[PDB]
Design a protein around this ligand. Structure first.
Ligand SMILES: Nc1ncnc2c1ncn2[C@@H]1O[C@H](COP(=O)(O)OP(=O)(O)OP(=O)(O)O)[C@@H](O)[C@H]1O
Ligand SMILES: Nc1ncnc2c1ncn2[C@@H]1O[C@H](COP(=O)(O)OP(=O)(O)OP(=O)(O)O)[C@@H](O)[C@H]1O
Lengths: 239, 210, 663, 118
């Protein structure tokens, strides 16, 4: 459920759905989506009287954008018609944040953070890290907080875990026992969800436990490998 | 489910007794033939799978000819037939939300790859002796290792000295000593301490680290 | 039946072998008459139940078939083809050639003797009681069969089936054959009675129905099947019988690999083995052995449709064990070699651990404790302290671990331990998880099994929350117990302790205070007797000698030198065991000489009173210990001379053990 | 104590040193590797000498003077450090691909520790 529509005091619920092949693999986790389909009922025999469960049979995802680079041509026509007008660098700083008094040095740091640089796999073994990472420290009441919700909606992929670290060992990886075959496989992470885009966290004073020992490897080489009870695999990261 | 191709009528039996006679059946086990059976799951090469998912996996049933060839951590490359088996939808009744079509590969001929077997000709084996005749090549190898960083030739010779390895002669009816070599680094930050640590894994010669 | 039920005609039959065992009658005259028939007589008179039918008596039997130019098929061919089929046609050849009444047993002097003849005559008279079921051949055996292959120069004479293959390469056509494999035996179960014959009684007719025993699950039959108690309106209701049912031996074990022929890759795996006949109770956990035996797979007979398709889970069946590497009884010649040569205080000092540089003082402090001896037969309820314990400290770079632990692996019953594993809670025994057999057994650590021996410990700063209890409870006499919620039973405590505490970071600073790195003041200054040290001072002449010391071992491979003839460890072990069987009693002049010794021990220790270097304030617990080691050294060097000079050897050691820190 | 080499990387600031750094990172945003991996994996299959009385005579002299100079200075060294002092030169002859432990190998082994300790 999109976490904005029914607030009284509740926690959100969840459903399940299937699809057909010529509309599968069209979604990544972390997006706004809309969907249209049926509300039929199956009955699994793995609780009282003979009760069944709900699920959606979907038909068509007329979603919003992906937020794998195929699109039409009239979109890029205006873009090239805008990109020839050489006023982009100054016109964005007024037009990015329509609710921010000035702050010109900070505002320019955000537009370069969103797009990034490149990545070299240059003909040797090693590589450079093509990314930038900023900080904002200062007095309360200088809009470092509410500026950060503003980058979340404008990003293609964004998460928002900005509080208290949230068990910094379980930020990157989690393994647990399984209902079927009792196995140890990889499930969760805050980084693996957030590749290609930007995370945003805070409170770098009163976390001393594991928050620093979890970001030292996660940054500067962007190549983690979990050495927990099952696998030891170097999964990619470009955060 | 091992003939790989023909879905014959199975024989749901282990061993029969009493063929159409009054003779107690005996079985010759030297003239009974056997074969083995081993499943292995294969992950995804986690560099060319684009960043939207964890690695996935499927599995493969091979036979005796290339068992014990697969150490866990090898860049393997298999080829076989694609195959489904199992009854999905009838073997239990009402069968709601249960796949009954397991993906299998009944395949052949694995190969290790490298991106242990590198056969060289007479040419390159002679040239490497020809450059062995030079009395400087210990120094050239030090400078030709990390093509990004200045200096640290004391560090640079140490890595190639460690990577090639020193022997351990085991004591006959006695404890062998340490013949492993184990170097250590420390340094104030951003001074390329972790730089050279990741490119030893590219030329690792089957030495995958954590 | 149709659809490929008949097979191809095979040229290898069995009737050609059946008559070839008939010419295993009295014909082998090379090896007092028929030698394998001579062993047939020493079983029928009931004293031993294992015949041995080797390959040597087959190959020589084939050696003297080199001149008879007729068709004689190969024997070691077929018995490595299908080995298990070569016992059932074998027993049906012995019975035609077994001399039965060759023994003399009257009433007693044989287990199950009058009753089997009572049973046989009850079936023999019921063979003619009409105015019928013959014995299955498994009933009257009272014997077994065995096999034994060859790996001698007869294999290099002329021609394999007995190369010691590992477990790794064995899965192929080696299933249904006879193969030997070496290994290490683990998981020894017990001996349980298996079934081979049956006897149901219905208490109406008394006709005991017999059957062959199949696999581990079977089913009894009905009651209306017999010949007399059946076929009427009344049938005797069947039930079992114990005493009329002969039962065999059975015991299960598992093997692993030698950890030297394993490849660089995968871990080794196990295998299942069984026993039959009377090779039982002859293996042990930790036996570096090999078994020769025959191969067969087994069905699973449980959940065979959904799972258990055609899996096999085989075992191997044993045939032979060739075990390896195992007091005034033809050993006294080497006890005289110590008596004639003498040389107690020095040659034996160079005997134990000659592989170090210097330190003859500490190699002498240990040999006295490797003999021990009963302190005093107290009689009354005064359980006195015995078995003093020496601890070491210091941080050399000469790998101090293999100095001490090398002594432990040659000293008797002295078990090795470390910090990890059997910690101070699992130093004694406890109750744990077990397999599906009898759980909640009393699994032990070290001290419940190494009673009255050597407890050679290392890594004293490891797992100290349980260890600091664990060291006091053995230094305290007789409270090794399990004070758990299972039981409150207490067992003995009689074992010496040899400790080596590692210092704090870097070197122990001798200019600083001691006990900066050992964390137990109360365990040390009042409940031990002597200490040592392994401090390193820079000294040029010793270290270059120590440099030649360590470099000499690399160019060659041998380490011995310095005009010392190396001594076998059995000799001093016999010398210790003979010295432990003396226990001399002291005279009066010795206790007269220690009261003046303790006064001179009292006065100088009561002069310093400082926290600079020294420990101790002259306890009588140190006084009684110096009596303990004196009679110990009077035990090893017993010439019945308990006097002033014998105890002068004793205070000679306490003064050099002390003040090892003053350099 | 179970390790041997504790390289302490310096980061001292010299105006010719950093200037040389500044272009070399810049020149790379735009004797071979597979020959190198063959040379070492061929050199894992050649025989191991271990045996020359000449090279063992000089290194123990080379030990004894620093055995006078370890304890009155920075860091105490132990007997296992000698098992390094064979092992580095032992592998250094494996670079040479020969069966004679020469003299020249014992000079780089001493000099490498001298920077590692001083
Ligand atoms: N430079 C600015 N321009 C426009 N609005 C601002 C600016 N600075 C603060 N605000 C306003 O402050 C209001 C509330 O922000 P808030 O008081 O939560 O900031 P804050 O989170 O306390 O700052 P800090 O993160 O430093 O503690 C917002 O509605 C925002 O519009
Ligand atoms: N001493 C150096 N000489 C040349 N380039 C360097 C040096 N130190 C760092 N660099 C450059 O900086 C980049 C990254 O350095 P790196 O992140 O490996 O520092 P680090 O070793 O990880 O330090 P830390 O582990 O403390 O973060 C490399 O691309 C490298 O070109």
């Amino acid at each position: 459920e999109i976490p904005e529509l029914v607030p009284v005091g509740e926690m959100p619920r969840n459903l399940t759905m299937t699809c057909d092949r010529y509309l599968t693999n069209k979604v990544i986790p972390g997006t706004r989506v809309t969907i249209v389909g049926i509300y039929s009922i199956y009955n699994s025999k793995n609780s009282g009287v003979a009760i069944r469960t709900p699920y959606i049979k979907i038909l068509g995802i007329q979603s919003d954008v992906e937020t794998v680079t195929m699109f039409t041509e009239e979109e890029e026509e205006e873009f090239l018609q805008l990109s020839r007008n050489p006023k982009l660098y100054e016109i964005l700083t007024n037009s990015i944040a329509p609710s921010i008094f000035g702050n010109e040095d900070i505002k320019k740091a955000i537009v370069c953070l969103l797009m990034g640089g490149s990545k070299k796999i240059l003909p040797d073994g090693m590589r450079l890290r093509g990314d930038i990472n900023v900080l904002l420290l200062g007095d309360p009441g200088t809009a470092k907080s509410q500026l950060l919700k503003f980058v979340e909606k404008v990003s293609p992929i964004a998460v928002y875990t900005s509080g208290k670290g949230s068990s910094a060992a379980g930020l990157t990886a989690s393994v647990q026992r399984d209902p079927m075959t009792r196995e140890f496989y990889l499930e969760g992470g805050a980084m693996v969800l957030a590749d290609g885009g930007v995370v945003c966290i805070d409170e770098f004073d009163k976390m001393r436990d594991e928050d620093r020992v979890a970001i030292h490897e996660a940054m500067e080489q962007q190549t983690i490998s979990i050495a927990k009870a099952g696998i030891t695999t170097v999964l990619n990261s470009r955060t | 489910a091992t003939t790989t191709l023909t879905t014959r009528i199975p024989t749901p039996a282990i061993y029969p007794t009493e063929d159409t006679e009054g003779n107690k059946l005996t079985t010759e086990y030297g003239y009974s033939t056997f074969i083995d059976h081993q499943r292995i799951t294969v992950q995804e090469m986690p560099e060319m799978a684009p960043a939207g998912q964890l690695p996935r996996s499927i599995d493969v049933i091979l036979d005796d000819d290339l068992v014990d060839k697969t150490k866990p951590g090898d860049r393997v490359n298999v080829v076989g037939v694609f195959k489904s088996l199992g009854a999905g939808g009838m073997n239990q009744s009402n069968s709601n939300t249960l796949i009954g079509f397991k993906t299998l590969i009944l395949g052949n001929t694995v190969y290790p790859l490298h991106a242990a077997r590198q056969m060289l000709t007479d040419f390159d084996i002679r040239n490497i002796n020809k450059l062995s005749k030079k009395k400087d090549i210990f120094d050239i190898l030090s400078q030709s290792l990390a093509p990004s960083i200045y200096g640290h030739d004391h560090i640079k010779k140490a890595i190639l000295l460690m990577l090639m390895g020193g022997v351990e002669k085991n004591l006959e009816n006695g404890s062998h000593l340490r013949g492993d070599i184990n170097i250590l680094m420390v340094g104030d930050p951003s001074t390329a301490k972790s730089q050279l640590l990741r490119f030893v894994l590219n030329t690792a010669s089957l030495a995958i680290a954590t | 039946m149709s659809a490929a039920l008949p097979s191809i005609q095979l040229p290898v039959d069995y009737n050609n072998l059946f008559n070839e065992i008939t010419d295993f009658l009295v014909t082998f005259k090379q090896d007092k008459g028929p030698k394998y028939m001579a062993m047939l007589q020493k079983v029928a008179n009931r004293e031993l139940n294992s015949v041995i039918i080797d390959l040597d008596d087959i190959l020589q039997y084939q050696n003297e078939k080199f001149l008879q130019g007729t068709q004689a098929d190969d024997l070691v061919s077929a018995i490595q083809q299908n080995a298990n089929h070569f016992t059932e046609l074998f027993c049906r050849a012995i019975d035609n050639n077994m001399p039965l009444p060759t023994k003399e047993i009257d009433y007693k002097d044989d287990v199950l003797d009058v009753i089997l003849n009572q049973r046989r005559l009850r079936n023999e008279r019921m063979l003619s009681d009409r105015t019928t079921e013959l014995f299955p051949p498994n009933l009257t055996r009272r014997y077994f069969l065995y096999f034994k292959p060859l790996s001698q120069n007869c294999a290099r004479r002329y021609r394999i089936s007995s190369k010691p293959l590992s477990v790794r390469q064995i899965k192929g056509d080696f299933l249904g054959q006879l193969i030997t494999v070496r290994g290490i035996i683990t998981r020894v179960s017990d001996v349980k009675p298996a079934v081979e014959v049956i006897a149901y009684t219905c208490d109406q007719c008394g006709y005991e129905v017999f059957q062959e025993v199949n696999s581990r699950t079977f089913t009894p039959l009905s009651e209306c099947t017999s010949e007399e108690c059946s076929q009427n309106q009344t049938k005797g209701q069947l039930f079992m019988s114990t005493r009329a049912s002969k039962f065999s031996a059975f015991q299960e074990c598992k093997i692993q690999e030698l950890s030297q022929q394993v490849p660089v890759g995968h871990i080794p795996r196990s295998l299942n083995i069984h026993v039959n006949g009377t090779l039982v109770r002859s293996l042990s956990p930790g036996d570096i052995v090999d078994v020769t035996g025959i191969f067969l797979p087994a069905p699973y007979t449980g959940f065979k449709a959904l799972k258990a398709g055609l899996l096999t889970e085989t075992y191997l069946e044993a045939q032979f064990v060739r075990q390896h590497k195992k007091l005034t009884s033809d050993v006294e010649e080497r006890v005289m070699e110590l008596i004639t040569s003498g040389d107690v205080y020095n040659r034996l000092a160079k005997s134990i651990a000659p592989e170090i540089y210097g330190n003859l003082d500490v190699k002498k402090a240990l040999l006295l404790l490797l003999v021990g001896g009963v302190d005093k037969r107290v009689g009354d309820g005064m359980k006195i302290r015995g078995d003093i314990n020496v601890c070491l400290m210091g941080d050399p770079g000469v790998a101090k671990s293999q100095l001490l632990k090398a002594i432990c692996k040659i000293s008797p019953r002295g078990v090795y331990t470390t910090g990890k594993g059997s910690s101070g809670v699992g130093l004694t025994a406890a109750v744990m998880k077990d397999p599906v057999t009898d759980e909640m057994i009393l699994e032990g650590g070290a001290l419940v099994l190494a009673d009255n021996g050597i407890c050679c410990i290392d890594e004293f700063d490891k797992m100290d929350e349980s260890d600091r209890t664990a060291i006091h409870e053995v230094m305290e006499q007789q409270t090794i117990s399990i004070s758990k919620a299972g039981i409150n039973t207490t067992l003995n405590a009689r074992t010496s302790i040899l400790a080596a505490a590692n210092p704090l970071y870097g070197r122990y600073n001798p200019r600083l205070s001691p006990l900066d790195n050992i964390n137990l003041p109360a365990a040390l200054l009042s409940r031990f007797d002597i200490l040592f040290l392994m401090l390193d001072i820079p000294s040029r002449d010793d270290d270059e000698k120590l440099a030649e010391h360590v470099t000499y071992v690399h160019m060659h491979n041998k380490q011995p030198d310095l005009d010392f003839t190396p001594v076998e460890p059995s000799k001093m072990r016999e010398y210790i065991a003979y010295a432990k069987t003396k226990r001399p009693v002291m005279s009066e002049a010795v206790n007269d000489y220690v009261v003046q010794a303790y006064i001179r021990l009292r006065q100088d220790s009561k002069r310093e009173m400082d926290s600079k270097f020294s420990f101790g304030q002259a306890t009588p617990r140190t006084l009684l210990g110096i009596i303990r080691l004196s009679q110990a050294l009077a035990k090893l060097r017993l010439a019945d001379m308990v006097d002033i000079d014998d105890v002068e050897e004793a205070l000679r050691l306490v003064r050099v053990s002390k003040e090892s820190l003053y350099q | 104590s179970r390790f041997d080499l504790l390289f302490v990387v310096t980061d001292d600031i010299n105006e010719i040193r950093d200037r040389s750094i500044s272009e070399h990172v810049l020149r790379t945003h735009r004797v071979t590797i597979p020959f190198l991996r063959k040379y070492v994996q061929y050199a894992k299959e050649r025989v191991i000498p271990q045996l020359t009385q000449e090279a063992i005579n000089v290194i123990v002299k080379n030990y004894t003077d620093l055995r006078n100079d370890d304890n009155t200075k920075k860091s105490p060294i132990t007997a296992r450090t000698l098992e390094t002092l064979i092992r580095l030169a032992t592998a250094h002859a494996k670079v040479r691909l020969s069966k004679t432990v020469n003299k020249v190998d014992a000079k780089v082994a001493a000099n490498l520790l001298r920077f590692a300790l001083l």
